[PDB]
Design a protein around this ligand. Sequence first.
Ligand code: HEA
Ligand code: HEA
Ligand SMILES: CCCCCCCCCCCCCCCCCC(=O)OC[C@H](COP(=O)(O)OCCN)OC(=O)CCCCCCCCCCCCCCCCC
Ligand SMILES: [Cu+2]
Ligand SMILES: [Zn+2]
Lengths: 196, 91, 297, 495, 265, 157, 48, 54
Amino acid sequence: LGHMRVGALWQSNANSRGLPNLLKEVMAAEPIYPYTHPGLSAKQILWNTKFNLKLEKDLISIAESAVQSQTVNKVVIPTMLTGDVNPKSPASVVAKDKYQLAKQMAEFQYKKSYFEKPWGYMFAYYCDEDRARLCGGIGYVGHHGGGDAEILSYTEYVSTVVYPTIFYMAITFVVSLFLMYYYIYGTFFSSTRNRF
Amino acid sequence: MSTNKNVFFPPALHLKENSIFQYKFKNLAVRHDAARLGIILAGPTLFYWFTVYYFKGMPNGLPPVLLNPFVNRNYRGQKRDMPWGTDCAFL
Amino acid sequence: SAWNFQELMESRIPDYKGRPNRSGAELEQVKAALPKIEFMTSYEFDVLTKTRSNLTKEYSYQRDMRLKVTELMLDEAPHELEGLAVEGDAALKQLAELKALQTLTEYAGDLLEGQNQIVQRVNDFVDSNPVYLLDQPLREEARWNLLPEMDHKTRSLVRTELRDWLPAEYRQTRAVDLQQVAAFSPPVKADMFRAIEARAKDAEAEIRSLPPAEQAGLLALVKDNVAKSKAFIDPTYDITPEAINACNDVDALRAMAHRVTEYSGDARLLAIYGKAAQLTGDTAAQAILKEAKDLVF
Amino acid sequence: MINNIMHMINKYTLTTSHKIIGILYGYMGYIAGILGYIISMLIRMELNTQGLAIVRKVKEVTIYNNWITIHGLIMLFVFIMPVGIGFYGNYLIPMLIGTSELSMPRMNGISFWMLIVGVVIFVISNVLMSKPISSGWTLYPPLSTRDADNIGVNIDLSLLVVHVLGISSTIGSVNYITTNKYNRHVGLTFMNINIYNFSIIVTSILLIGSLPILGVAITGLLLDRNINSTIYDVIGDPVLYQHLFWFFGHPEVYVIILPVFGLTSLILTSIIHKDIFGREGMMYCIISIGVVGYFVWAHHMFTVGLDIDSRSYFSIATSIISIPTSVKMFSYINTWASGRGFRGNNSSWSFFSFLICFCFGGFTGLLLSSGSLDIMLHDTYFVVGHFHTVLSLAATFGLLIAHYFFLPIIFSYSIFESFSFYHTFLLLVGALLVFYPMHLAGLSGMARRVPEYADIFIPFMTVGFHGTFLLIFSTLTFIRSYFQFLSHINHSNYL
Amino acid sequence: GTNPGDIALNSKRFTVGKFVAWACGGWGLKDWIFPSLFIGRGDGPDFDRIVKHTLQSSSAIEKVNWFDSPFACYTEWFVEHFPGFFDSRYRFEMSAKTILANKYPIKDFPVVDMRSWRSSRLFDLFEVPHPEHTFVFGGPVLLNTEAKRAERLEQEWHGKDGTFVDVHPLNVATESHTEVSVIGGIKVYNGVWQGGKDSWKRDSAKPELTAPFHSPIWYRNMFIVKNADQLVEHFGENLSDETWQEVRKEHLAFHERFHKDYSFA
Amino acid sequence: DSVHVFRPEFAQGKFRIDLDQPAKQNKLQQQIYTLTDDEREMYEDEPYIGVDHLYEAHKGSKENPVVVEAIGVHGNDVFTGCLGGCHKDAADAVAYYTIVPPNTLAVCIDCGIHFVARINEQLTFWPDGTQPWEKVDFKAVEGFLYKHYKYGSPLMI
Amino acid sequence: LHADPIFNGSKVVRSIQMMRSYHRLPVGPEPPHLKIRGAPLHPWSMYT
Amino acid sequence: MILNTNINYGGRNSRLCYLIPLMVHTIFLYLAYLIYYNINLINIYLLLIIIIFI
Ligand code: HEA
Ligand code: HEA
Ligand SMILES: CCCCCCCCCCCCCCCCCC(=O)OC[C@H](COP(=O)(O)OCCN)OC(=O)CCCCCCCCCCCCCCCCC
Ligand SMILES: [Cu+2]
Ligand SMILES: [Zn+2]
């Protein structure tokens, strides 16, 4: 029977490969708490965790008891079209007045400094890593494409490539017809020469 | 829950007709199929036998066909060994 | 008729008709029967139904599982973080302890994900076989229709019954929002603050019963935790009527009005806007505020 | 190891998995291609040298006639269809529409093993037995029934081989249509399935409609030979046989060609990193070619004695069929434009060779469509040039594109591009030297199916000699490349 | 992508393997007599190029956690075939760290592997050799099944009225909601429990058990899927287009000293 | 007056699975059709409904992604796909396919759309006539689910 | 301290070994395909 | 319980994948023998019994 597996727990087979843990791939052998919990030792982290856990338990109990024993004076029922499962989202994602524009601008600047540029650099590294993986004679890397490839839009390509090509082809067609007819028969319009 | 219930103990349905058979012959398609069958049974079949009754004591005067002339009795000297082994028709 | 190329169900094309046609009599009867209705601006519904504290919208049982796993992991921390030995100074020992703690939490984190996956699989089973988990007459409506296509009443009854089929600890109900309940009720906010202060005081005593360096470190941590907890429950606990009265800046009152509108939009808006109008002499604004305090609040 | 041996034999005989049946079809197709190539080399060596240098006797030219007939049959019915339709058809069709198996899983295995039965009967009949069938690949009576060199039973065995191959093809065709019509995954309409599936569907429709007629013709031949009837005798209608056979004959040709179009389109989408230019246009052109191929069958009988009106009609219909193929060629040329096809890929260069050779072969065959001009070109070497610069340079190169594109995917080892470049280029140059001269030897009057020719035709056969040597080199390179494909290193040191 | 196996038994002048190769394919007299032209440099790791690429690197080689990751066993292949490897890897790791050190409560990390490439033909998505049994549990599911259908055209094709498609009765009832809450004395009805499509948010993330409740930290690995032929990327809210163009220019300006002295021939 | 009883369908297995919950299995197997060129022309000139797309987050935002539920084995990668052209720079000649981990948030960066695949397994009672004819409780189901989650259950092939 | 395997577990690595889309063309910020006389060939070129 | 697969017919291995081809081979070689030696190799009724049985 060979090596029979026991239990149907997860194995990284061809169909299932799982969700990569980039945090462990990057932070290999380096602790995460220097970045997530700056300036704290393990004992302080544990003490803080226990304190916050008890506080959160108390707050949750109070909130549940509050919601469970409150009289109802108003009933709110949102308006939805029949055949709709949930109401539309009342919220919006567009700044309306100038103050919201300033707030959105500040948030975007922070996010660009801390979230978007890291994403861009990680994606660039990923592209280059894939190129290196498909190199060395395994894949078709370097056969075509690159930074020197000339990329044209649809309009530009049709106008500056396709039409002149067809124009030259038409010129070639007429010229070849005339020159071939003269080449064989020897006359442009009188069929065979010296025969008619 | 599963439809197996009605597989095991299907409902029993009351009919006004004396039998299910008649109930199925109030549908136009079955009536027209029965009409086609009756037409075929009535006209041709009864007629055909009538003819063998009407011409029971009369001969067949059709002129026989001409298959093989005498001068072609050898069939042009063509091999005719059938796969059975002898130059005779399977019949 | 000699061939049959059917399917399980013909595709169902919805008929639209339109909005109901009610004459004067029917419209009059409908209007008479309906209660007193206060039509709410979409902003009111938004601030009511925002996602504030329950960021990931986790169900109650998921939160309970996470807290229990945290308790268990805390219980087992001393064993793992005991007897660690590594060549190096205090910093190397500290980083070794941090790494051991990270390994423990990752070990405990993977168990929580496994249990969540198991409960979610049980629920996936619940919705996978509704015909076998419902009584008449809802069983036929579950058999012949999908969720979107059901009648509203039958849809709601079917979903509630399916959820009730599960044990108590597998039912999927969104967890409570602490910030939400605090925002929409004064007494609960005061109770939460009192509880925060009581826990902080108890922890401060416990700290006072410890050797010196730990005392300073954990006191700093307690102060930071109290400040951030107060911010978490209600970011606008410093916008008090006294603060509004002491404020004499149009820009500051505008910022306070923004922050109150974001949070709850309660009568502090009336106070701030009244004071801003007084400093600016806006009779139309004062009239609108009078209307608001008569009707809105 | 008895259990292991029997398990392997059960794996490759009881199977119904489309992937396994596909690889089996591919293997049989490649083997039969090599056998046909060997016989072709024999034929060429007979032609190149003067004085019946191989058979040595006029009485024994029946050996050469047997060679040409088995070359034709092997290369048509066991090389292209098993590879073009059997191999990629089974391996890819279920995958490209997102489903597990073909409909009728058992009929797939039945099809493959019917093919193997036919190959076995053919190989035994035409090798181990004496005085084999020697009547050209178009088994024209009364030569194939009332002759002196065709009397043995093995001739009847070859006819039955044709029967079994027909049965296998019909089963495969029905299976492909059925699987493509009902098992498509949700959200995929019939005309959104990729190009290859559609071409396979139309090919299957072609095979279904014509094979029964070929079966009738072959049963007629068998009855004439055995029970001594007179369907195709001096008092029969050999022209009737020709009509039936060629009613099957041209649909077979388009069945051969269309799947190559589908495969080339798919591979192009995969290697130029761009969609097909006018995909709907190509699909409609494919179905048009399929439909129009059923009305042109008698352009292969312009000298039989057909009525003058029928001659004109069939020239017209052949031109009609010529149109949509031109549309497809233009679509290909525009597809390659603006794309980023790999500049150093044997697939790319084989596509170029396929395009050029198919255009040239289509033109040469469009000359032959005219009834009048077919007076001077029927049964000369112009027809041989035509259908070898189409079959052996457009169908073969399309299959080379597929071979060099799907080897890494199936086996998971990349391809030795320099080796493949040598193979493909020498195959191109050698083949052109063999067949191109044939064209100008047909306009000069050289008849076909002759082992001995007049002295006026020496230059063409010298160029053919050159081409045959280059072909031997290319095929050895190809086989050795494949052997090297599945073999680990043989040298390794320290630098 | 080749493991030589045992160098000892393949370096001999005469071997069973070499004779078999000669007989069937892969070896011949041209290899014995002329090894400079037919074996030549051969295929293997290049120590000289590895040393050059290592010495061209900046201090990013010291500060990178690469050597302890599970990919440390691929170090030489990437160092040789990825010019400027360590600088790019250091930027990637610092990007991950700065994402981790944000103020947001959910940290999204991009993930790109062999599965991150879309294709118009299904056989391109399987690992080679293909599994024996494919699509056992049905074929692909299209995202478009969760978009609203073309109601107007659907009504038109059937000849139905299709006049009031865009106007529907309003539904304001307490029997149409199952998710009832109480919020400060106000009983709010909102939403219906649909099923596993309402729990996507929590299952996508994993908590940090030591993070306090008043500052949660959740880790999320966002998968990235790209066509690989589009040439234009649109990340959505993750990365704005202007930022992406800026990153393009910066990457190609800094990673130009590891690419300038080589020719593509 | 007569009593007639229609002959029931005795088949079990996949037939009974498909007749027990026809809506779900139909949803699995029922085809839906894309638009022809005429309909594309008549659709691209259709008007929006109200001023809502200007403010609300679209279907496919990082907060409101497109959720697609497939069937299979828990943990197996999910096959999904776009029909092309979601963004004006994304090709739309033919459908484009994807293979994505089961329950993660993925982003089509050709179109910038956030989606969430998810596999829900089809665990059903053995179709041999011993199916529950009335509401069943969690006990026996608990046992079967435990056995499956620990060791797995056969496939209905 | 090692838990039951799960697909999103802490110990799951990126799939860079097993090839899936063999015939793709990597795309992104890439250097110009410069050509020089005598310089060593670039790793990412069709020539070796 | 049982994990349910797609709606297609999964496919089973069977001996009909080669028995039918062997039956065709048998019929055709039997006909060849009858053509050559004019006598059946085995009884026609036995052959039909085999064909029916398969
Ligand atoms: C697909 C069909 C096919 C193929 C591939 C070929 C291949 C070749 N054929 Fe022929 N041929 C016919 C179909 C084909 N032929 C037919 C139908 C006839 C008429 C029979 C008759 O007239 O009755 C005929 C007749 C015919 C004659 C007739 C002689 C005479 O009538 O006077 C000659 C002689 O020159 C000839 C030569 C060749 C040569 C030299 C090759 C090749 O050597 C050149 C190309 C070689 C290749 C290398 C292909 C070999 C394939 C493999 C290498 C498999 C490898 C795998 C793949 C690449 C997929 N062929
Ligand atoms: C293998 C595939 C294949 C293909 C695709 C074709 C395609 C065509 N074939 Fe032929 N043919 C054979 C295989 C094929 N053939 C074989 C094997 C034989 C011999 C059987 C034997 O006798 O043993 C044969 C024999 C044969 C004959 C026999 C001549 C004779 O025996 O008397 C004729 C003559 O009518 C003919 C015609 C054509 C025509 C008109 C096309 C057309 O389809 C070609 C169309 C192609 C194009 C037209 C190219 C596109 C052109 C352009 C890009 C634009 C130009 C267009 C215009 C100006 C209109 N073929
Ligand atoms: C189970 C299904 C069928 C299986 C078939 C298997 C065999 C395949 C071979 C196909 C064709 C075989 C042809 C050989 C039969 C020759 C028949 C023959 O000799 O015909 C003559 C006979 C009429 O004789 P006649 O001269 O008119 O009589 C004078 C007074 N009545 O006329 C006849 O007897 C005509 C008989 C019909 C025509 C043949 C068509 C096929 C039907 C099968 C018949 C039996 C086949 C016997 C083959 C033996 C080997 C298996
Ligand atoms: Cu033809
Ligand atoms: Zn997309």
